[PDB]
């Protein structure tokens, strides 16, 4: 098993994955903050304070009450300053012809500011083809949703295998997965795992939690995605540091 | 098999489905226009001219370059004038806690103007639970995506059966399906079918077309969803009338 720094140099590595893996090793962080807030001021204050602790900031641009492309300009300034990627968790899931417009255009112009986006594989490979026609020219990457954290997820068995095949057949653009575990045996592919908290539990709408030690250490994922475990805490900086140290040590102990 | 007008009166019918079925029978239309345009002025000019020919106008609010809630105010005026429902084809596909915010909030405030939305079933029933916590109080309906039109779709076999079970267990909010065919044997549930053109063919990004006669007449669906077959035509009114007459006669001939 290679370190993040060595994976950053693999011959078939995507440039976006390489950039991410380099800053993960430099900063000793495999934490992605899920910045699930409705106010631009809170998003930017979290990005600035937690920037040093995170490899990635995950957005849902469509829950931000005061979105403007200028807010995303300020977010890019912080991403460059503190060295993290921006991941818009848009979960594209339409025919190729539709998703290309949803990615490039409308009010959000996601491709103009998002290093990474993600897509569901249920529509077939056209979803990836459509996205890549915008994303390849704009030097972007994509994650495929191979497994989900929620109760009753149908992303199991042959579905997960189809996501892995689709990623591997589109390595020019697909840099990894949303998954609960290592699903690809190819080390060029990032595994990002949501549904993470230090304590056992869930929410009232089907979210299920596992610990950083379980998903990084036992299940072999690379990056934890954490929302409420940080966002709902009083001291979001110390919460982020707890999650960072947990995920980083789990990673180191799997390396041996 | 019951007429649309008789289905509108079924004991377990959802009010949104009833409203739709009534205006389908009154206007002799089972055509949903896929208004896949980037300009508000073109969206509103299509809604006004084609309003009399359609039971429903399907939006992708996130490809509209000049979206404002005022554009949707003008669209509602046309929907009320000409009697059609507004369907935002958002394809919600996240955990319940996320989709409730994506449905109610952000810039688009989808639930404030959309009669109908749709959701993927891959995350499990939490996606429906989250949406229904916004949509039930706002007297809205939802369609579940049971089958897709695109090449390589994984929405087959047990997946389609899971979508039908989920719809039937959430009949307070779920009024039907995006599907290629009749998937539910319960007549209270609408079947809407995209991937429709009069001529054989497809697009370059995995879209596949079938005719109105095939999907309404042979496959037993209720409503055709048509984008480019109308939108790319020179005379979009006559194109809409051709699709309306095709879908309506296919429906009548299945009734006998
Ligand atoms: O793509 C994702 O990040 C995602 C996939 C998934 O399987 N589960 C999942 O929870 N998410 C997202 O990750 C975040 C989880 O947030 P918390 O439950 O607050 O930690 C939310 O923004 C979800 O939308
Ligand atoms: O939910 C949908 O409407 C949808 C589901 C699906 O399986 N296939 C599909 O084509 N659609 C949508 O229906 C429209 C099809 O447009 P045309 O291919 O131009 O007729 C697009 O806006 C798609 O996003």
**Contacts (Cβ under 8 Å, ≥6 apart) of B139:** B15, B16
d(CA B230, CA B212): 13
Residue contact B62–A62, C-beta within 8 A: yes
**Contacts (Cβ under 8 Å, ≥6 apart) of B109:** B69
Per residue in A76-112, is it b (16+ CB within 10 Å) or e — as a string? eebbeebbbbbbbbbbbbbbbbbbbbbbbbbbbebbb
Residue contact B64–A106, C-beta within 8 A: yes
d(CA A93, CA A126): 10
d(CA A110, CA A229): 26
- Is there an atom of ligand 1 within 6 Å of A181 CB? no
- Is there an atom of ligand 1 within 6 Å of A210 CB? no
Helices (H), chain A: 4-7, 15-27, 40-50, 69-82, 96-104, 110-113, 126-135, 158-168, 212, 228-231, 236-255
- The count of residues in chain B is 256
Look at strands A223-226 and B31-34 and give their pairing: unpaired
Residue contact B95–A206, C-beta within 8 A: yes
8 A C-beta contact, residue A116 and residue A90: no
Q: Which residue range is the domain that position B207 belongs to?
A: 1-255
8 A C-beta contact, residue A219 and residue A247: no
Q: What is the dihedral of CA B153, B159, B161, B163, to 10 degrees?
A: -90
d(CA B62, CA A188): 32
Per residue in A233-251, is it b (16+ CB within 10 Å) or e — as a string? eeebeebbbbbbebbbebb
First to last CA, chain A: 9
- Is there an atom of ligand 1 within 6 Å of A153 CB? no
8 A C-beta contact, residue B34 and residue B194: yes
8 A C-beta contact, residue A161 and residue A129: no
d(CA B86, CA B39): 17
A-chain residues within 8 Å CB-CB of B155? 122
The alpha carbon of B95 and the centre of ligand 1 are apart by a number of angstroms equal to 7
8 A C-beta contact, residue B52 and residue B27: yes
Helix (H) or strand (E) holding A92: strand A85-92
CATH code of the domain in which B57 resides: 3.20.20.70
Q: Angle at the Cα of A153 (from A145 to A98), degrees rounded to 5?
A: 45
> In angstroms, how far is CA B51 from the centroid of its own chain?
15
Residue nearest to atom 8 of ligand 1 (CA): A149
User: Sign of dihedral through CA atoms B237, B242, B247, B249?
Assistant: positive
8 A C-beta contact, residue B112 and residue B137: no
Interhelix angle A126-135/A96-104, rounded to 10 degrees, is 30
The alpha carbon of B195 and the centre of ligand 2 are apart by a number of angstroms equal to 6
8 A C-beta contact, residue B213 and residue B224: no
Residue A57's nearest CA partner among A232, B219, A37 is A37
Look at strands B141-145 and B174-178 and give their pairing: parallel
- Closest ligand 1 atom to Cα of A196: 20
Residue B19: count of CB within 10 angstroms of its CB: 16
Minimal Cα distance from B91: which residue of A? A93
**Residue A138, CB-side half-sphere exposure with 13 Å CA sphere:** 20
d(CA A110, CA B11): 45
d(CA B143, CA B176): 5
DSSP B92-123: E-S-HHHHHHHHH-TTT-HHHH-SEEEEESTT
8 A C-beta contact, residue B4 and residue B24: yes
Exposed, middle or buried by CB within 10 Å (0-12, 13-18, 19+), for B42? middle
Which residue in A60, A91, A150 is closest to B126 by CB distance? A150
- Select from B58, B66, B92, B93 the residue whose CB has the most chain A CBs within 10 Å, as the one to mutate to test that interface: B93
Residue A244's nearest CA partner among A223, A219, A221 is A223
Exposed, middle or buried by CB within 10 Å (0-12, 13-18, 19+), for B240? buried
Residue contact B63–A105, C-beta within 8 A: yes
User: Sign of dihedral through CA atoms A59, B162, B35, B58?
Assistant: negative
Check residue B210 and report its DSSP letter. Answer: B
8 A C-beta contact, residue A179 and residue A147: yes
The resolution, in angstroms to one decimal, equals 1.2
d(CA B177, CA B183): 8
Number of domains in chain B: 1
Residue contact B98–A36, C-beta within 8 A: yes
Q: What is the CA radius of gyration of chain A?
A: 17
Which residue in B91, B108, B203 is closest to A97 by CB distance? B203
> In angstroms, how far is CA A40 from the centroid of its own chain?
20
Which residue in B36, B107, B124 is closest to A107 by CB distance? B107
Q: Which residues line ligand 2 (CB under 6 A)?
A: A 94-95, 98; B 34, 36, 58, 60, 89, 118, 148-150, 178, 194-195, 207, 225-229
Tell me whether residue A109 is one of the annotated catalytic residues: no
> In angstroms, how far is CA B66 from the centroid of its own chain?
23
- Select from A36, A72, A101, A150 the residue whose CB has the most chain B CBs within 10 Å, as the one to mutate to test that interface: A150
Check residue B215 and report its DSSP letter. Answer: I
Instruction: Check A19, A48, A91, A129 and give the catalytic one.
Output: A91
């Amino acid at each position: 098993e290679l370190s993040f720094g060595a994976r950053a140099e693999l011959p078939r590595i995507h440039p976006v994955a390489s950039k991410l893996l380099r800053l993960m090793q430099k900063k000793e962080t495999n934490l992605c903050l899920s910045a699930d807030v409705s106010l631009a001021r809170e998003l930017l204050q979290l990005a600035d304070a937690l920037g040093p602790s995170i490899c990635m900031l995950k957005t849902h641009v469509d829950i931000l009450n005061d979105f403007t492309l200028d807010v995303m300009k300020e977010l890019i300034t912080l991403a460059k300053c503190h060295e993290f990627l921006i991941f818009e968790d848009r979960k594209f899931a339409d025919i190729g012809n539709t998703v290309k417009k949803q990615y490039e255009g409308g009010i959000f112009k996601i491709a103009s500011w998002a290093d990474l986006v993600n897509a569901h594989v249920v529509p077939g490979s056209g979803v990836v083809k459509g996205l890549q026609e915008v994303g390849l020219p704009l030097h972007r990457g994509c994650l495929l949703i191979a497994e989900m954290s929620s109760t009753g997820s149908l992303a199991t068995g042959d579905y997960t295998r189809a996501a892995v095949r689709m990623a591997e057949e589109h390595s020019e653009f697909v840099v990894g997965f949303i998954s609960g575990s290592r699903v690809s045996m190819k080390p060029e592919f990032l595994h990002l795992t949501p549904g993470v908290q230090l304590e056992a539990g869930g929410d009232n709408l089907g979210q299920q939690y596992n610990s950083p030690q379980e998903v990084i250490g036992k299940r072999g994922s690379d990056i934890i995605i954490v929302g409420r475990g940080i966002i709902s805490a009083a001291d979001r900086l110390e919460a982020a540091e707890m999650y960072r140290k947990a995920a980083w040590e789990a990673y180191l102990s799997r390396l041996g």
